[model samples]
Target: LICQSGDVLSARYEIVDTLGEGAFGKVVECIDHKAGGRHVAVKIVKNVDRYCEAARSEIQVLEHLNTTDPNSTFRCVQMLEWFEHHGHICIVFELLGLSTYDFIKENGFLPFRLDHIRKMAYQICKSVNFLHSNKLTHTDLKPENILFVQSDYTEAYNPKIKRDERTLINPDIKVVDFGSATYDDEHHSTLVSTRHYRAPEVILALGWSQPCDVWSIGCILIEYYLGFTVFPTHDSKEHLAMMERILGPLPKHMIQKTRKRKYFHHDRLDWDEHSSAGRYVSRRCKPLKEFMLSQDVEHERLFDLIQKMLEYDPAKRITLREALKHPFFDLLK
Candidate 1:
C-alpha cells in the first residue's frame, strides 16, 4: 500500500514522512494520536507473501525482546505496537537517529575517538550478547543497522588529524533490523551478511554460525577506528586477497575444506599481486596492526579484540559474551 505524507495508518497513527525504503518495504515517521501524539517509526512491510513472512519473523523476534527487556535495557529497538492495515504489516518503534555509517560520513569520515568507540562497542556487545544468549544470531550486523539513540553531535577541529571530529551528544545506540536474525535451532542460511563484513568461512562456502556475527563486528570495530572498511572489494577473490593483506593468510585447513576451488591455486589465494585489482588492494589495505592510531593500552586492547573476533576458524572467534569481558571494555564495565 502506498503511504502519502498525510496518510493515516490504522485510523490512529498519521504518517509524517517516509523515513526510508528497502526491499522489505518502507519505514515512515508517524505520530501516534492514540498515544498522545508521540512520534514513532512505523515499518510497513509490503503486501507480498515473501515479505509478509519476514515481517512476521521479525515481529516474533522483536516481540520476544520487547517482552524480555521491556525497558529497552539491552539497546535493541523497542517495538511499541503492530497491526495489519490494507494487507501491510505495520510494526511501530521508538524513532531513532542516523545510522553509525551516516554519522561517520557526515563527520568527513573522521574516525571516532577511543572513548566514544569504547562506549559504542560495549553497548553493541551487551545487546548482541543478549541475542546470543537467547540462541539468536544477527545475520546482518553492519554500521547501517546500528542507529544512535539521538544523533545530536558537537563538532570541533582537531589539529592532529587536521579534520573536524564529532562528539556524539548521546553515544547510545540500538541494534535494529531483526528481519534477518536467525535462531540457532533453525536452518542456517548458506549465504549471510553483506559482502565486506562477511566471514572467511561464509565466502568459502563453509558452514556458518554465531561466529559470523562476531566476524562482522570485528570488521565494524575496524571501520570505526579507521574511517573506511578494511576490505573494500566486491569480488570474493579480491576480498580474500584483501583479508590476506590485512589479517594474514587463511588457515590451510579452511582451504582444504573450501568448496570455492577457483579462489585458490593449491593452498593459497590465486590472486595476481600485479593485476589491477591486486594493485588496488595493495594500495588500499595494510596489515591490521599498522592501522592502529597509537601504541596505547586502549588501542592495543581494541586491536586485540578485533584480532580475536576476526579469527578464521569460527570456533576460535571470540563470542560476544567473552568479548564483553575483554580488556578493551574493562573501563566501560
Candidate 2:
C-alpha cells in the first residue's frame, strides 16, 4: 500500500480517502496543503514492470489530451504530475466529480431525457474526435471511466463534506482511465475494453485500431439511453448471435473471415428462422427500427447514429469526426 487515509505524499498532498480502485491500484482523494489546500486525486500504481508500462502510456495519452484545443472544451481528465515513491508510481489529477456509473445507480437507471443526451452526445463526440486526431484510441470506453466535472460538488461520499443529491445532473465530462489505450501506428491486442462493450472487430480478432473507439461509443450511447447494454452477454458465440439477431446475418466478408464455424454451419438469410442448426436463434432477426420502436425510442436520429457507429466493418464504422457532424446532435446547434 503506497498510501492510505492520513498519509501524506512528500508533505504536499495529504491523503483523505480512497477514491476507487483500477488495474494499477487504488486512487486516493487528497488535499494539497502546500498547494493552498486544493483537492485532487492521486492514483498510486505498483512500480512493477507491467503496471509501470501502463502508467507511462496513460501519462503519454493524458498529456496529449491536456494540450489546448482552440475549438474543444470536452476533454480527458488532466494529469497534473507524477512521481516515484516507496517503489510505486503516484500520479496527481484534478479531482473530478461523480462517475456516470454512480449517476446511473443514483438515479435508479432511468433513461435520460433527449436534451441531456444531446448535450452529452456532442461533447463526447468532440472529445473522441480529439483522440483520433492525435493518433490515440481509448480502447476502454464505459460509464465508469467517464466522469462529470462538477466543481460545485458537495459530496455524497465526501471524506470532508456532507451532501447527497441522487438525480440526473448533466455536468461537463472528462474521459479517464487510459491504461488500455492504443496508438494508431501500433498493432493492437485482441483483448481490449470490457467484454460487454468490446467492439466486434476486437472480439472477432479481425484487427482493430482507432475505429474500435467509435464502436465502443456506440455501445456506451445505447447503455446511456436504455440503462443496460445492447449486448448483455459475455459469451462469444451468444454475443455474436445476439448481434446477428438484431443486425441480420453477418456481412459476407465477416462470415468469410471469422473462424467460428459453428455459426456459418447453417445458411444465413433470415427467410428461415429454424434449421437443424441455424446460425441465428429460434426467432427471426429483428430490424433496428423494430428494436428502437419497441424501446419507445426518444429520437429516431439516435438510432441512425448508433447504427453507423455499430457497423460491423471497422473500415465502414462511423469516424469520430463524422459522428460529431451527425444530425443526432443537431439539437446542440
Please, what are the lDDT tens digits per residue for candidate 2 over residues 1-333?
348788888669999988888778888899999889989999999768989889988887777667665323767787889887787788899898877777767666755556766776677778878888888888888888888887243334423324343444446788889878888887677688888778877776777888888888887887778776667564676667767777766778876776656645644433334553343443433555665633444478899898998898999888988888888777677
**C-alpha lDDT score of every prediction, in listed order:** 0.91, 0.75
- Tens-digit per-residue lDDT, 1-333, candidate 1: 256688888888899988778788989999888989989999999899979988999999998988999999999999988999888999989999988998999888888888889999999989999999989999899998999999998888889878777889888999999988999998888888999899998999899888999999999999999889988778899999999999898999999999899999988899999999978999999899998879998899999999999999998888988899899988876
Clashes of each: 0, 0
State the number of backbone clashes in model 2. Answer: 0
lDDT of 2 at 88: 79
Q: Which stretches of candidate 2 lie over 4 Å from their true place?
A: 68-72, 151-169, 260-287, 291-298
Mark the regions of model 1 whose C-alpha exceeds 4 Å error after superposition. Answer: 161-164
Note the residue pairs that clash in candidate 2. none
Best by lDDT: 1
